Amino acid sequence: PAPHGGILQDLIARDALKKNELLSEAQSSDILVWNLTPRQLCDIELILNGGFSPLTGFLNENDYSSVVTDSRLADGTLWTIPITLDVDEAFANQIKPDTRIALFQDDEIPIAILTVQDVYKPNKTIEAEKVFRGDPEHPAISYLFNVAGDYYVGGSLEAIQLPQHYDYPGLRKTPAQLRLEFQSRQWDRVVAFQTRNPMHRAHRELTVRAAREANAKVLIHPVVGLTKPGDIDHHTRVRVYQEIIKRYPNGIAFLSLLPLAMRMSGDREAVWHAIIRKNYGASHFIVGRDHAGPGKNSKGVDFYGPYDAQELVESYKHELDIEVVPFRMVTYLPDEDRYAPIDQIDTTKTRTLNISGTELRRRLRVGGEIPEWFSYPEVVKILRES
Ligand SMILES: [Co+2]
């Protein structure tokens, strides 16, 4: 399908012919330099590779304000999560419109040149309330107030190179690369699966079922960048994904890593995910229960309703030109030796076998056996005493 906004803003491709010139400038002694923070590095990779199309830079206050209150850029284009370059007060004081800033990675690798449009002090309370629902315990709000700089710098970017990664080379396909991969296989219908956790037999079954019902193929698109605090190590997860994809039906699935910095912003994040996956070439997107949700706060109160994400994305589906596929968990039916959607099993006389996240975690820590009906032996081994 077409990128969000119609154009894949692959700035690496756009500025390829001026890389030497931009690199030279970024290394000059007179240019202002900003060392990107971990979250900014994830965000900038997705802006530069077109993952955040139509974005071509960090949001100026005009667009930021519209995103915060109306979930749209100033021109009306759907966009739910503000992507801004947050800096400290002193740095903001040295900036003025038209100032060109060299953005670096690890204070040594030139990533891009930002042409400043504005520098402003956002009202973070409004951002926390409108974008993240206001609970002080929400991961995005804690980040917003404690870690994020208090000043935002809006501006357009010119690309030099994508952030450098030293893990799993070639596994982070860009939107252009994935789109070509799909086209090369004549995959016009692709259902994307978001995850920041390991995958078991049930996930293999639900994604395969989703693909078959939609007459499409499967894109396992796990996040490897910034996920939820306490998640399984990224190396363990990647090994799990590489192994489990081998268990999929002949030529129905493809695996690629997404270097996204999740905000754990529930429904708004689910819409953002749909946009991102559309930019990466997907036609369908699975939306889970409490999709991208932080769970419950200290008082046992859910940050988001379980179906808020599904409902919000469904409401924007026509505008996004993407199809929403509700996450349909499957379970194992021993009396029929088959897998079926938990929904399919009405409150009647039907037995099922399951292993809770709690039981799984505890068995893995004591070397307890895990049944094959729950997960493939090769996958379990990877999670074993990890
Ligand atoms: Co690593």
Q: How is this structure best described in words?
A:
- Sulfate binds at residues 194, 196, 292.
- It catalyses: sulfate + ATP + H(+) = adenosine 5'-phosphosulfate + diphosphate.
- It is an enzyme of class 2 (transferase).
- It is found in: Cytoplasm.
- The protein has 2 domains: 1-161, Sulfate adenylyltransferase, CATH 3.10.400; 174-386, 3-Layer(aba) Sandwich (Rossmann fold), CATH 3.40.50.
- Helix content is 35%, strand content 16%.
- The chain has helices at 11-14, 19-26, 38-48, 61-70, 89-93, 124-132, 139-147, 175-184, 201-213, 234-244, 266-279, 308-320, 357-366, 377-383, and strands at 32-35, 57-58, 85-87, 100-105, 109-120, 151-159, 190-193, 217-220, 253-255, 284-287, 323-326, 330-333, 338-341.
- Strands 1, 2, 3, 4, 5 and 6 form a 6-stranded mixed beta sheet that branches. The chain has a 5-stranded parallel beta sheet with strand order 9-8-7-10-11, sandwiched between helices. Strands 12-13 form a two-stranded antiparallel sheet.
- Strand 8, helix 10 and strand 9 (253-255) form a beta-alpha-beta unit.
- The longest helix is centred in the last third of the chain and has 14 residues, at 266-279.
- Cobalt (II) ion binds next to helix 10.
- Cobalt (II) ion binds at residues 167, 234-235.
